[PDB]
Amino acid sequence: PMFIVNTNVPRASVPDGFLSELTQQLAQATGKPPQYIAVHVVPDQLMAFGGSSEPCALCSLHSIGKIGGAQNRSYSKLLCGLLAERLRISPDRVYIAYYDMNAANVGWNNSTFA
Amino acid sequence: PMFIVNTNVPRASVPDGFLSELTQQLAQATGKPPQYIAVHVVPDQLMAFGGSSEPCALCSLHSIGKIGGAQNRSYSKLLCGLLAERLRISPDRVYIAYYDMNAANVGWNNSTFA
Amino acid sequence: PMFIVNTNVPRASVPDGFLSELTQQLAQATGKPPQYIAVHVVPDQLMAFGGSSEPCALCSLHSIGKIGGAQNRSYSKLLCGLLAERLRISPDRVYIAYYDMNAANVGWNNSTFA
Numbered sequence A, B, C: 001p002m003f004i005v006n007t008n009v010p011r012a013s014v015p016d017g018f019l020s021e022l023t024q025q026l027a028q029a030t031g032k033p034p035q036y037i038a039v040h041v042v043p044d045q046l047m048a049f050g051g052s053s054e055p056c057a058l059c060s061l062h063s064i065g066k067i068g069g070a071q072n073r074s075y076s077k078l079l080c081g082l083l084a085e086r087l088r089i090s091p092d093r094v095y096i097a098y099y100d101m102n103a104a105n106v107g108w109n110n111s112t113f114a
Helices: A018-030 A069-087 B018-030 B069-087 C018-030 C069-087
Strands: A002-007 A038-042 A046-049 A057-063 A094-100 A106-108 B002-007 B038-042 B046-049 B057-063 B094-100 B106-108 C002-007 C038-042 C046-049 C057-063 C094-100 C106-108
Touching: A002 A069, A018 A038, A018 A069, A018 C046, A046 B018, A057 A069, A069 A094, A069 B106, A106 C069, B002 B069, B018 B038, B018 B069, B046 C018, B057 B069, B069 B094, B069 C106, C002 C069, C018 C038, C018 C069, C057 C069, C069 C094
Parallel strands: A002 A038, A057 A094, B002 B038, B057 B094, C002 C038, C057 C094
Antiparallel strands: A002 A057, A038 C046, A046 B038, A094 B106, A106 C094, B002 B057, B046 C038, B094 C106, C002 C057
Protein backbone atom coordinates (compact mmCIF):
# COMPACT_ATOMS: atom_id res chain seq x y z
CA PRO A 1 0.00 0.00 0.00
CA MET A 2 0.98 3.56 -0.64
CA PHE A 3 -0.32 6.52 1.36
CA ILE A 4 0.32 10.14 0.33
CA VAL A 5 -0.70 13.24 2.23
CA ASN A 6 -0.46 16.75 0.84
CA THR A 7 -1.07 19.48 3.40
CA ASN A 8 -0.70 23.25 3.94
CA VAL A 9 0.53 22.57 7.54
CA PRO A 10 4.18 23.65 7.81
CA ARG A 11 7.02 21.17 7.90
CA ALA A 12 7.87 22.06 11.49
CA SER A 13 4.42 20.97 12.58
CA VAL A 14 4.98 17.42 11.31
CA PRO A 15 6.20 15.41 14.31
CA ASP A 16 9.34 13.35 14.22
CA GLY A 17 8.25 9.74 13.84
CA PHE A 18 5.14 10.57 11.86
CA LEU A 19 6.19 8.49 8.81
CA SER A 20 6.87 5.52 11.10
CA GLU A 21 3.53 5.90 12.84
CA LEU A 22 1.72 6.00 9.55
CA THR A 23 3.64 2.91 8.38
CA GLN A 24 2.74 0.96 11.52
CA GLN A 25 -0.90 1.99 11.64
CA LEU A 26 -1.40 1.30 7.94
CA ALA A 27 0.24 -2.12 8.23
CA GLN A 28 -2.27 -2.91 11.06
CA ALA A 29 -5.21 -1.51 9.21
CA THR A 30 -4.59 -3.06 5.80
CA GLY A 31 -3.16 -6.28 7.28
CA LYS A 32 -0.16 -5.96 5.05
CA PRO A 33 3.43 -6.33 6.21
CA PRO A 34 5.13 -3.02 6.97
CA GLN A 35 7.82 -3.84 4.44
CA TYR A 36 5.22 -3.24 1.68
CA ILE A 37 3.88 0.07 3.03
CA ALA A 38 5.12 3.29 1.53
CA VAL A 39 4.30 6.72 2.96
CA HIS A 40 4.83 10.23 1.61
CA VAL A 41 4.09 13.46 3.45
CA VAL A 42 4.17 16.81 1.61
CA PRO A 43 3.87 19.86 3.91
CA ASP A 44 3.89 23.58 3.19
CA GLN A 45 1.56 23.28 0.20
CA LEU A 46 -0.50 26.03 -1.43
CA MET A 47 -3.98 24.64 -0.93
CA ALA A 48 -7.57 25.54 -0.21
CA PHE A 49 -10.47 23.39 0.95
CA GLY A 50 -13.97 24.96 0.53
CA GLY A 51 -12.27 28.26 -0.41
CA SER A 52 -10.40 28.39 2.90
CA SER A 53 -6.68 28.16 3.60
CA GLU A 54 -7.14 26.90 7.12
CA PRO A 55 -5.34 23.57 7.72
CA CYS A 56 -6.43 20.87 5.31
CA ALA A 57 -5.17 17.71 3.64
CA LEU A 58 -5.66 15.92 0.37
CA CYS A 59 -4.58 12.25 0.57
CA SER A 60 -4.56 9.02 -1.39
CA LEU A 61 -4.34 5.38 -0.34
CA HIS A 62 -3.55 2.92 -3.14
CA SER A 63 -3.63 -0.80 -2.34
CA ILE A 64 -3.89 -4.07 -4.23
CA GLY A 65 -7.13 -5.19 -2.65
CA LYS A 66 -8.12 -4.35 0.97
CA ILE A 67 -10.23 -1.50 -0.47
CA GLY A 68 -14.03 -1.35 -0.22
CA GLY A 69 -16.97 0.36 1.44
CA ALA A 70 -16.54 -0.75 5.01
CA GLN A 71 -12.77 -0.89 4.91
CA ASN A 72 -12.56 2.62 3.49
CA ARG A 73 -14.81 3.96 6.25
CA SER A 74 -12.52 2.41 8.80
CA TYR A 75 -9.41 3.79 7.05
CA SER A 76 -10.98 7.21 7.03
CA LYS A 77 -11.67 7.18 10.72
CA LEU A 78 -8.10 6.02 11.38
CA LEU A 79 -6.37 8.46 9.07
CA CYS A 80 -8.51 11.51 9.93
CA GLY A 81 -7.80 10.65 13.55
CA LEU A 82 -4.08 10.64 12.97
CA LEU A 83 -4.12 13.85 10.95
CA ALA A 84 -6.22 15.59 13.68
CA GLU A 85 -4.04 14.37 16.56
CA ARG A 86 -0.69 14.84 14.92
CA LEU A 87 -1.16 17.69 12.42
CA ARG A 88 -4.15 19.46 14.02
CA ILE A 89 -6.24 19.16 10.89
CA SER A 90 -10.00 18.96 11.24
CA PRO A 91 -11.46 15.74 9.83
CA ASP A 92 -13.88 17.80 7.79
CA ARG A 93 -10.99 19.40 5.95
CA VAL A 94 -9.50 16.05 4.79
CA TYR A 95 -10.22 14.16 1.60
CA ILE A 96 -8.78 10.68 0.99
CA ALA A 97 -8.99 9.12 -2.46
CA TYR A 98 -8.96 5.29 -2.29
CA TYR A 99 -7.68 3.22 -5.19
CA ASP A 100 -8.09 -0.55 -5.49
CA MET A 101 -5.25 -1.34 -7.87
CA ASN A 102 -5.02 -4.44 -10.10
CA ALA A 103 -1.75 -6.25 -9.38
CA ALA A 104 -0.78 -6.01 -13.05
CA ASN A 105 -1.07 -2.18 -12.74
CA VAL A 106 1.51 -1.84 -9.99
CA GLY A 107 5.17 -1.85 -10.89
CA TRP A 108 7.84 -2.86 -8.35
CA ASN A 109 11.33 -4.33 -8.53
CA ASN A 110 11.62 -4.43 -12.37
CA SER A 111 8.24 -6.15 -12.83
CA THR A 112 4.66 -5.91 -11.59
CA PHE A 113 2.87 -7.63 -8.74
CA ALA A 114 0.81 -9.83 -11.09
CA PRO B 1 -13.96 17.85 -6.23
CA MET B 2 -10.23 18.02 -5.98
CA PHE B 3 -8.22 19.96 -8.52
CA ILE B 4 -4.43 19.66 -8.49
CA VAL B 5 -2.03 21.51 -10.71
CA ASN B 6 1.70 20.98 -10.88
CA THR B 7 3.67 23.45 -12.95
CA ASN B 8 7.19 24.63 -13.74
CA VAL B 9 5.97 28.26 -13.59
CA PRO B 10 7.60 29.96 -10.56
CA ARG B 11 5.70 30.76 -7.37
CA ALA B 12 5.99 34.49 -7.98
CA SER B 13 4.10 34.08 -11.25
CA VAL B 14 1.04 32.60 -9.52
CA PRO B 15 -1.20 35.63 -8.97
CA ASP B 16 -2.74 36.46 -5.66
CA GLY B 17 -6.27 35.09 -5.48
CA PHE B 18 -5.70 32.25 -7.89
CA LEU B 19 -6.83 29.46 -5.48
CA SER B 20 -10.10 31.33 -4.85
CA GLU B 21 -10.64 31.85 -8.57
CA LEU B 22 -10.18 28.16 -9.20
CA THR B 23 -12.53 27.28 -6.32
CA GLN B 24 -15.23 29.61 -7.64
CA GLN B 25 -15.07 28.58 -11.24
CA LEU B 26 -14.91 24.88 -10.46
CA ALA B 27 -17.98 25.17 -8.23
CA GLN B 28 -19.83 26.82 -11.10
CA ALA B 29 -18.63 24.42 -13.73
CA THR B 30 -19.20 21.18 -11.80
CA GLY B 31 -22.37 22.43 -10.13
CA LYS B 32 -20.96 21.37 -6.76
CA PRO B 33 -21.10 23.62 -3.67
CA PRO B 34 -17.87 25.60 -3.16
CA GLN B 35 -17.56 24.10 0.27
CA TYR B 36 -16.73 20.75 -1.29
CA ILE B 37 -14.14 22.04 -3.76
CA ALA B 38 -10.48 21.60 -2.88
CA VAL B 39 -7.63 23.06 -4.91
CA HIS B 40 -3.86 22.57 -4.77
CA VAL B 41 -1.29 24.48 -6.82
CA VAL B 42 2.34 23.33 -6.94
CA PRO B 43 4.76 25.76 -8.69
CA ASP B 44 8.50 25.59 -9.32
CA GLN B 45 8.39 22.00 -10.48
CA LEU B 46 11.00 20.08 -12.48
CA MET B 47 9.02 19.01 -15.49
CA ALA B 48 8.95 18.74 -19.28
CA PHE B 49 6.17 18.42 -21.83
CA GLY B 50 7.11 17.12 -25.27
CA GLY B 51 10.75 17.20 -24.15
CA SER B 52 10.63 20.92 -23.51
CA SER B 53 10.89 22.88 -20.28
CA GLU B 54 8.81 25.76 -21.56
CA PRO B 55 5.87 26.52 -19.21
CA CYS B 56 3.60 23.50 -18.84
CA ALA B 57 1.15 21.96 -16.39
CA LEU B 58 0.09 18.47 -15.33
CA CYS B 59 -3.25 18.47 -13.52
CA SER B 60 -5.97 16.27 -12.18
CA LEU B 61 -9.66 16.75 -11.44
CA HIS B 62 -11.30 14.15 -9.20
CA SER B 63 -15.03 14.35 -8.63
CA ILE B 64 -17.84 12.10 -7.43
CA GLY B 65 -19.83 12.26 -10.63
CA LYS B 66 -19.99 15.27 -12.95
CA ILE B 67 -17.34 13.61 -15.13
CA GLY B 68 -17.95 12.69 -18.77
CA GLY B 69 -17.09 13.45 -22.35
CA ALA B 70 -18.96 16.71 -22.72
CA GLN B 71 -18.40 17.88 -19.17
CA ASN B 72 -14.67 17.15 -19.40
CA ARG B 73 -14.40 19.12 -22.61
CA SER B 74 -16.02 22.05 -20.85
CA TYR B 75 -13.67 21.73 -17.85
CA SER B 76 -10.68 21.64 -20.13
CA LYS B 77 -11.68 24.81 -21.90
CA LEU B 78 -12.23 26.51 -18.54
CA LEU B 79 -9.07 25.28 -16.87
CA CYS B 80 -6.75 25.72 -19.84
CA GLY B 81 -8.21 29.21 -20.17
CA LEU B 82 -7.39 30.01 -16.57
CA LEU B 83 -3.87 28.55 -16.80
CA ALA B 84 -3.22 30.55 -20.00
CA GLU B 85 -4.59 33.84 -18.64
CA ARG B 86 -3.16 33.61 -15.17
CA LEU B 87 0.01 31.53 -15.48
CA ARG B 88 0.81 32.17 -19.16
CA ILE B 89 0.82 28.47 -19.97
CA SER B 90 -0.13 27.45 -23.48
CA PRO B 91 -3.17 25.18 -23.57
CA ASP B 92 -1.26 22.64 -25.66
CA ARG B 93 1.21 22.22 -22.87
CA VAL B 94 -1.42 21.17 -20.30
CA TYR B 95 -2.67 17.68 -19.50
CA ILE B 96 -5.62 17.17 -17.13
CA ALA B 97 -6.48 13.70 -15.88
CA TYR B 98 -10.18 13.31 -15.01
CA TYR B 99 -11.31 10.84 -12.43
CA ASP B 100 -14.96 9.86 -11.72
CA MET B 101 -14.73 8.64 -8.13
CA ASN B 102 -17.15 6.19 -6.49
CA ALA B 103 -18.47 7.81 -3.33
CA ALA B 104 -17.33 4.76 -1.32
CA ASN B 105 -13.75 5.51 -2.52
CA VAL B 106 -13.67 9.06 -1.12
CA GLY B 107 -12.93 9.58 2.57
CA TRP B 108 -14.02 12.73 4.37
CA ASN B 109 -14.88 13.65 7.97
CA ASN B 110 -14.01 10.23 9.47
CA SER B 111 -16.13 8.33 6.96
CA THR B 112 -16.75 8.16 3.21
CA PHE B 113 -19.38 9.79 0.99
CA ALA B 114 -21.21 6.48 0.35
CA PRO C 1 1.74 9.65 -21.68
CA MET C 2 2.65 11.20 -18.46
CA PHE C 3 5.24 9.98 -15.97
CA ILE C 4 5.72 11.37 -12.46
CA VAL C 5 8.34 10.40 -9.94
CA ASN C 6 8.40 11.45 -6.30
CA THR C 7 11.60 10.68 -4.46
CA ASN C 8 13.58 11.43 -1.32
CA VAL C 9 16.76 11.66 -3.40
CA PRO C 10 18.01 15.25 -3.26
CA ARG C 11 17.77 17.59 -6.22
CA ALA C 12 21.48 17.75 -6.65
CA SER C 13 21.54 14.02 -7.18
CA VAL C 14 19.25 14.23 -10.21
CA PRO C 15 21.63 14.35 -13.11
CA ASP C 16 21.58 16.85 -15.88
CA GLY C 17 19.59 15.54 -18.85
CA PHE C 18 17.39 13.20 -16.81
CA LEU C 19 14.04 14.59 -17.92
CA SER C 20 15.10 14.30 -21.55
CA GLU C 21 16.27 10.76 -21.03
CA LEU C 22 12.96 9.80 -19.50
CA THR C 23 11.10 11.52 -22.31
CA GLN C 24 13.09 9.66 -24.94
CA GLN C 25 12.89 6.27 -23.37
CA LEU C 26 9.21 6.54 -22.58
CA ALA C 27 8.49 7.55 -26.16
CA GLN C 28 10.17 4.40 -27.27
CA ALA C 29 8.60 2.17 -24.75
CA THR C 30 5.05 3.39 -25.26
CA GLY C 31 5.53 3.87 -28.94
CA LYS C 32 4.15 7.39 -28.73
CA PRO C 33 5.88 10.46 -30.18
CA PRO C 34 8.03 12.36 -27.71
CA GLN C 35 5.99 15.45 -28.34
CA TYR C 36 3.17 13.74 -26.46
CA ILE C 37 5.27 12.63 -23.45
CA ALA C 38 5.28 14.60 -20.23
CA VAL C 39 7.61 13.96 -17.31
CA HIS C 40 7.81 15.36 -13.77
CA VAL C 41 10.49 14.66 -11.16
CA VAL C 42 9.94 15.68 -7.52
CA PRO C 43 13.08 15.32 -5.39
CA ASP C 44 13.77 16.05 -1.73
CA GLN C 45 10.57 14.42 -0.56
CA LEU C 46 9.74 13.23 2.96
CA MET C 47 9.08 9.54 2.33
CA ALA C 48 9.56 6.07 3.69
CA PHE C 49 9.28 2.68 2.02
CA GLY C 50 8.87 -0.35 4.25
CA GLY C 51 9.52 1.76 7.33
CA SER C 52 12.85 3.22 6.22
CA SER C 53 14.19 6.24 4.36
CA GLU C 54 16.94 4.97 2.12
CA PRO C 55 16.43 6.16 -1.47
CA CYS C 56 12.97 5.25 -2.74
CA ALA C 57 10.45 6.40 -5.34
CA LEU C 58 6.70 6.49 -5.77
CA CYS C 59 5.71 6.95 -9.42
CA SER C 60 2.78 6.98 -11.80
CA LEU C 61 2.45 6.39 -15.56
CA HIS C 62 -0.77 7.53 -17.15
CA SER C 63 -1.37 6.72 -20.77
CA ILE C 64 -4.29 6.47 -23.20
CA GLY C 65 -3.89 2.82 -23.99
CA LYS C 66 -0.48 1.08 -24.15
CA ILE C 67 -1.18 -0.23 -20.60
CA GLY C 68 -1.45 -3.91 -19.75
CA GLY C 69 0.21 -6.84 -18.07
CA ALA C 70 3.12 -7.43 -20.40
CA GLN C 71 3.61 -3.82 -21.31
CA ASN C 72 3.62 -2.77 -17.66
CA ARG C 73 6.23 -5.44 -16.85
CA SER C 74 8.40 -3.93 -19.58
CA TYR C 75 7.83 -0.37 -18.37
CA SER C 76 8.77 -1.40 -14.88
CA LYS C 77 12.02 -2.94 -15.97
CA LEU C 78 12.86 0.18 -17.99
CA LEU C 79 11.88 2.68 -15.31
CA CYS C 80 13.40 0.85 -12.36
CA GLY C 81 16.54 0.52 -14.47
CA LEU C 82 16.67 4.24 -15.04
CA LEU C 83 15.99 5.13 -11.43
CA ALA C 84 18.70 2.65 -10.25
CA GLU C 85 21.31 3.84 -12.77
CA ARG C 86 20.64 7.53 -12.52
CA LEU C 87 19.26 8.15 -9.01
CA ARG C 88 20.81 5.11 -7.26
CA ILE C 89 17.42 3.90 -6.06
CA SER C 90 17.09 0.17 -5.51
CA PRO C 91 14.34 -1.35 -7.69
CA ASP C 92 12.83 -2.94 -4.64
CA ARG C 93 12.08 0.51 -3.18
CA VAL C 94 10.11 1.74 -6.25
CA TYR C 95 6.37 1.52 -6.77
CA ILE C 96 4.84 2.61 -10.10
CA ALA C 97 1.07 3.00 -10.45
CA TYR C 98 -0.13 2.43 -14.06
CA TYR C 99 -3.32 4.08 -15.27
CA ASP C 100 -4.99 3.23 -18.59
CA MET C 101 -6.91 6.47 -19.24
CA ASN C 102 -9.97 6.81 -21.49
CA ALA C 103 -9.34 9.49 -24.15
CA ALA C 104 -12.44 11.41 -22.97
CA ASN C 105 -10.83 11.55 -19.47
CA VAL C 106 -7.67 13.35 -20.57
CA GLY C 107 -7.86 17.11 -21.09
CA TRP C 108 -5.47 18.92 -23.37
CA ASN C 109 -5.54 22.07 -25.46
CA ASN C 110 -8.96 23.27 -24.32
CA SER C 111 -10.68 19.96 -25.00
CA THR C 112 -10.09 16.25 -24.48
CA PHE C 113 -8.40 13.63 -26.60
CA ALA C 114 -11.73 11.95 -27.47
